[PDB]
Design a protein around this nucleic acid. Structure first.
Ligand code: MG
Ligand code: MG
Ligand code: MG
Ligand code: MG
Ligand code: MG
Ligand code: MG
Ligand code: MG
Ligand code: MG
Ligand code: MG
Ligand code: MG
Ligand code: MG
Ligand code: MG
Ligand code: MG
Ligand code: MG
Ligand code: MG
Ligand code: MG
Ligand code: MG
Ligand code: MG
Ligand code: MG
Ligand code: MG
Ligand code: MG
Ligand code: MG
Ligand code: MG
Ligand code: MG
Ligand code: MG
Ligand code: MG
Ligand code: MG
Ligand code: MG
Ligand code: MG
Ligand code: MG
Ligand code: MG
Ligand code: MG
Ligand code: MG
Ligand code: MG
Ligand code: MG
Ligand code: MG
Ligand code: MG
Ligand code: MG
Ligand code: MG
Ligand code: MG
Ligand code: MG
Ligand code: MG
Ligand code: MG
Ligand code: MG
Ligand code: MG
Ligand code: MG
Ligand code: MG
Ligand code: MG
Ligand code: MG
Ligand code: MG
Ligand code: MG
Ligand code: MG
Ligand code: MG
Ligand code: MG
Ligand code: MG
Ligand code: MG
Ligand code: MG
Ligand code: MG
Ligand code: MG
Ligand code: MG
Ligand code: MG
Ligand code: MG
Ligand code: MG
Ligand code: MG
Ligand code: MG
Ligand code: MG
Ligand code: MG
Ligand code: MG
Ligand code: MG
Ligand code: MG
Ligand code: MG
Ligand code: MG
Ligand code: MG
Ligand code: MG
Ligand code: MG
Ligand code: MG
Ligand code: MG
Ligand code: MG
Ligand code: ZN
Lengths: 107, 95, 69, 60
RNA sequence: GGGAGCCCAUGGUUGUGGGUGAGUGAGUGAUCCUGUACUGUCGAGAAAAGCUUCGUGAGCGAGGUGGCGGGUCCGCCCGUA
RNA sequence: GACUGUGUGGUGGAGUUGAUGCGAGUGAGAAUGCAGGCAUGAGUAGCGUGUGACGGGUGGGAAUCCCGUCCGCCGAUUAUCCAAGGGUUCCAGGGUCAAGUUUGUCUGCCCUGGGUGAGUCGGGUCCUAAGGCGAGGCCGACAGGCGUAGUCGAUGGGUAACCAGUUGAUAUUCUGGUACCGGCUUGUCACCGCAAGCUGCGGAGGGACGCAGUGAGGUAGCUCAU
RNA sequence: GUCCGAACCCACUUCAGUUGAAAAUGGAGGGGAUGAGUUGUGGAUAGGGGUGAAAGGCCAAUCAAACACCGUGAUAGCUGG
RNA sequence: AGUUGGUGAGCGAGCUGUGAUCCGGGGGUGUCCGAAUGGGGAAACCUGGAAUGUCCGGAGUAGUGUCCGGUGGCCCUGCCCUGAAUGUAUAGGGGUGUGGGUGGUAACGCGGGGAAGUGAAACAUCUUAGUACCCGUAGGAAGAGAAAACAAGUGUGAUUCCGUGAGUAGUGGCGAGCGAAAGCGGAGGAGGCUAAACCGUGUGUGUGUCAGGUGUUGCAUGUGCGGGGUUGUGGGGGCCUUGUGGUUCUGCUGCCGCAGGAUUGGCCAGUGAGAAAUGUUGCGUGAAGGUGAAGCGUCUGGGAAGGCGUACCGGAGUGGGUGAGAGUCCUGUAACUGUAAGCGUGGCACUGGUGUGGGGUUGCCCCGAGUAGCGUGGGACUCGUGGAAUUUCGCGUGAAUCUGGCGGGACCACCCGUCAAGCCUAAAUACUCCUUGGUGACCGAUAGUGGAUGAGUACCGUGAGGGAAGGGUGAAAA
């Protein structure tokens, strides 16, 4: 298994559910069952006292958003291969190939 | 040969309970030991660990409790515990 | 710290001393756990992992997987 | 015995076939004879079939 | 060592420190002990080791052991409610 | 006719209608049919030998729990301790859905924690019996059968400890007092020397043995007591 | 392989039970009770075989051939559906 | 870029990018039981090394109790010593540790043992059926296999398997039943070794052998190793006319010839069954991965994938997810790419390792023996003892050997075919405990596995063995 296209700290826009159009930061990701937590969207109670905080929603219900010309536009992602160097646990060097994400609709 | 054997591999944990604390009045300490260790080995290990003369070592085997739960009967591990009697004033600090 | 592949930069006798010190630390941790101390519970597993690492290095040296210093 | 120590001749299995042809299981054993042998320099008994004994495959 | 009621008191269904006093005589009497004794008896009532002693079909072993009273430490595993 | 509406509601929450073909695990009331659920008998029979009464307590709740006092019962056993077997049921605290032939605050039930201490007790480390297995071996088409040397196998032989005290739960085990046995080691005295000793190996002695009966000398126990 | 009679072993009569307290018992009596006695532990004999002071008795609560699995969805001119 | 498995959350950590968890590959550790293997044993337990310095090495103690590691099960087999009664000698004994074995396994294979119920409307031959079961024993397949074959007048040319022939010819208490082969059509397609003559090489022993030669020159038996040889209108050996790969230039036979010889050609041939088996270089990849296209706006709704409007991608519209029915939200899919690694694997080059015959000729020599046959008692063949070939087991008897043997359904003759009694052989065929991907006018919780959950569990039985039942809140525990 690999990771998801959405990672913690990303700024995403909600495209489905009770909070369509809401824009927030990805507070946490749960890769195993593909659910993410975005700030100030799914406010419900936990447990413990009340705890009015955010509940996870499906990762397919959010989308990475970019600011092209002053308007927020939801976009998909691609990956490009760039040459990197990785360190083996002992500390040696070797040149390897790593993927870097880019947002579409902005090249 | 690999796998150096330390006397602290035999002595696992001390038994803390009302009976153990009452036995502390007699310079007596109850330890949970490795279930394959004899009295002589436990005695030597305690001496080496604590720098303490040991007069007697008494051991018992205690059966683990069996409790019926969801998923049937569960059985807690068997334990052997050594009851070590210390010389008059030597004292062992278990914290 | 949790020990790593720099144990391969040590010698056999001091690696064995490391084994003994790790065993004694684990002994103390187990006693603390029995007596109700030891809030730091993760060290109780990490010390055993470190012992495993030191035995790994010793056995690779003994089996000539890695040349002995 | 019914097995030859030379050539491993062993019993066969067939039928008693009466006049009424009510077939019954029966055995044909080889003619095994126990004779003294001197092999290389070893004196010992061996169960030897008469066929091997006639052929001379056994040293006495 | 064990063994009753007297103590400022205790603590009031409680235990502490002192307060323990006596120890014997006779009768009776075993399925126990002497005892695998003794007597009777035919149906004629395990084995092996420990043990004592005897050598040597084996090795060890040095001129070192083996004995008798005295001192120190060691004495395992399983069961134990 | 099997059945049905392209009528109209209710419940419900994700599928499915008509035409025309195609394929069937395609139709149930019976098999003393199978599985589950539920009636009938019926609030009926039974509640497994028996002696309980009362005062007080606890509690939401008491004939059925606790304490006390009367009374009754067992006592060659309704007592006490083992073996076999069981396996945590033992103790303390919390609990009253279920289980307990009723109730239940109670429990051999549930939950949590705790509890079993041995050189001498009972087994192993020692010994063999019956019997089992069995190096080689002999026998048997194969599979296998038997058995030597051996090696196991108690229900037997051998084998060194007692009294007192203590815990909510352990006690020839812990503690106190006083012993014993085997090792190791040490002090001292005496003694050896083809010819010390030790260990193996066997010889012999011993272990070592029935049933029945009487008597004698004792002690345990019991009874009585100026 | 005496007599009377507890334990112990048995199971003659009777009553009760007979959806039992109990898939063979209970109450009252009854036979043996030093013997061909009874009992504990371990062991041996295995299905056309074992064992039987012999009843075709017993061999894990139904034995004129145990139980389990397999041949197997045996077969049934019969009964049911 | 999260992560410390699940049933089933928060602590205390590690990763805080020093890149973890995770994924592939390879190692390390691996208690005790189990073939279980030091010895014992009621599987998962117990107990050890006669006395000496202790079984050996280490740790610990004043020392013994102790600790850690190593070692030794049994059987077969190799090598060395010894050799009983006893003489040869063997058994045996003592070393050494050379190799192999033990046990497990779902189906398929081969060899052997071998029912009954059943059917025949009873039943015994027969059937069931060589089935069930059992014993031995493999391999990735096995078995078979290179004509002692078929054919019938020409011919075919190892074996296995499939379709036909054919439910035929037959067989059968001629009952119930059973049941071929040739031929033809296909799948797949190899043929190779050996024994024997004859020639080189030692021990139960010479006295006859131009350079040479001695009572022997090298003379006589029969071994173990080399060549040689392998077939059927016969072959081979022998006897000869020739031919070996160009030679440095060694002994022998005759100063002819034969053989060893050596970098070098070499037609070739190779890791195969093929009398054999040892390094470097050329391919796409499986295990992991990498890239992977293209949609918004409104409406109703708890929620849009639905409605309405309107665009896009498509080598991608197979699916499955996402709060309801998604080609463009997610996972992917198409297409392409990477594979470092593998014991990697397959194939190529090289390396390296191994190596010719044709013609004539009978005079001789060889051509697989307790075998083939024959008798008898059984079994398999369509064939159930018969007119009984062919094939097979037990017991007797017992041949020829090329002008010979065997087969062509008794047998004989001729004719045709073939050459047994030695061995090895790929492919087409059988199977799935397993691995990966995929599929279903298959099931959908009384169904489908006994088992969607603690299922071979609970539970029942002394035991072998038998053997269940229990799925669904919601979009989110809110
Ligand atoms: Mg890495
Ligand atoms: Mg990625
Ligand atoms: Mg004990
Ligand atoms: Mg557990
Ligand atoms: Mg038959
Ligand atoms: Mg003859
Ligand atoms: Mg008297
Ligand atoms: Mg006890
Ligand atoms: Mg007790
Ligand atoms: Mg239709
Ligand atoms: Mg139906
Ligand atoms: Mg119905
Ligand atoms: Mg019913
Ligand atoms: Mg009713
Ligand atoms: Mg009434
Ligand atoms: Mg009525
Ligand atoms: Mg009534
Ligand atoms: Mg009534
Ligand atoms: Mg009553
Ligand atoms: Mg009552
Ligand atoms: Mg009372
Ligand atoms: Mg009374
Ligand atoms: Mg009395
Ligand atoms: Mg117990
Ligand atoms: Mg409990
Ligand atoms: Mg219980
Ligand atoms: Mg209790
Ligand atoms: Mg009740
Ligand atoms: Mg209670
Ligand atoms: Mg209680
Ligand atoms: Mg012994
Ligand atoms: Mg015996
Ligand atoms: Mg044997
Ligand atoms: Mg012995
Ligand atoms: Mg024994
Ligand atoms: Mg008690
Ligand atoms: Mg006592
Ligand atoms: Mg004491
Ligand atoms: Mg004797
Ligand atoms: Mg005697
Ligand atoms: Mg009498
Ligand atoms: Mg009794
Ligand atoms: Mg009667
Ligand atoms: Mg009656
Ligand atoms: Mg009488
Ligand atoms: Mg038995
Ligand atoms: Mg009769
Ligand atoms: Mg019975
Ligand atoms: Mg019968
Ligand atoms: Mg059948
Ligand atoms: Mg039927
Ligand atoms: Mg009828
Ligand atoms: Mg790691
Ligand atoms: Mg073992
Ligand atoms: Mg064993
Ligand atoms: Mg071993
Ligand atoms: Mg020794
Ligand atoms: Mg094998
Ligand atoms: Mg029959
Ligand atoms: Mg019939
Ligand atoms: Mg019939
Ligand atoms: Mg083959
Ligand atoms: Mg050919
Ligand atoms: Mg063909
Ligand atoms: Mg040859
Ligand atoms: Mg995409
Ligand atoms: Mg839409
Ligand atoms: Mg031939
Ligand atoms: Mg013939
Ligand atoms: Mg015949
Ligand atoms: Mg036939
Ligand atoms: Mg014939
Ligand atoms: Mg003819
Ligand atoms: Mg073959
Ligand atoms: Mg089911
Ligand atoms: Mg349903
Ligand atoms: Mg159901
Ligand atoms: Mg059971
Ligand atoms: Zn023979």
């Amino acid at each position: 298994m690999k990771s998801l296209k959405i990672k913690k700290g990303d700024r995403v826009k909600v495209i489905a559910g009770n909070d369509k159009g809401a824009i927030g930061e990805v507070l946490s990701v749960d890769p195993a069952r593909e659910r993410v937590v975005v700030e100030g969207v799914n406010i419900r109670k936990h447990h413990g006292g009340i705890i009015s905080s955010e509940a996870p929603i499906h990762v397919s219900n959010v989308q990475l958003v970019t600011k092209i010309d002053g308007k927020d536009v939801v976009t998909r992602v691609g990956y490009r291969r760039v040459d990197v160097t990785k360190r083996r646990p002992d500390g040696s060097e070797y040149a390897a190939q790593r993927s870097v994400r880019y947002l579409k609709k902005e090249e | 040969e690999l796998k150096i054997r330390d006397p602290r591999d035999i002595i696992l944990a001390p038994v803390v309970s009302e009976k153990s604390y009452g036995l502390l009045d007699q310079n007596t300490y109850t330890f949970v030991v490795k279930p394959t260790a004899n009295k002589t080995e436990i005695k030597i290990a305690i001496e080496q660990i604590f720098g303490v003369k040991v007069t007697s070592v008494n051991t018992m085997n205690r059966k683990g409790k069996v409790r019926r739960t969801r998923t049937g009967v569960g059985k807690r591990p068997d334990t052997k515990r050594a009851i070590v009697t210390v010389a008059e004033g030597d004292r062992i600090d278990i914290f | 710290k949790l020990s790593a592949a720099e144990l391969r930069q040590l010698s056999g006798e001091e690696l064995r001393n490391k084994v003994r010190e790790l065993k004694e630390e684990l002994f103390g941790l187990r006693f603390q756990s029995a007596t109700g101390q030891l809030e730091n519970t993760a060290r109780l597993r990490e010390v055993r992992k470190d012992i495993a690492r030191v035995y790994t290095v010793l056995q690779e040296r003994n089996l000539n997987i890695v040349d002995d210093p | 015995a019914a097995v030859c120590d030379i050539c491993a001749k062993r019993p066969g299995f067939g039928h008693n076939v009466p006049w009424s042809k009510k077939k019954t299981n029966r055995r044909w054993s080889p003619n095994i004879q126990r004779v003294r042998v001197v092999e290389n320099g070893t004196h010992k008994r061996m169960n030897v079939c008469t066929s091997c004994l006639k052929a001379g495959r056994v040293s006495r």
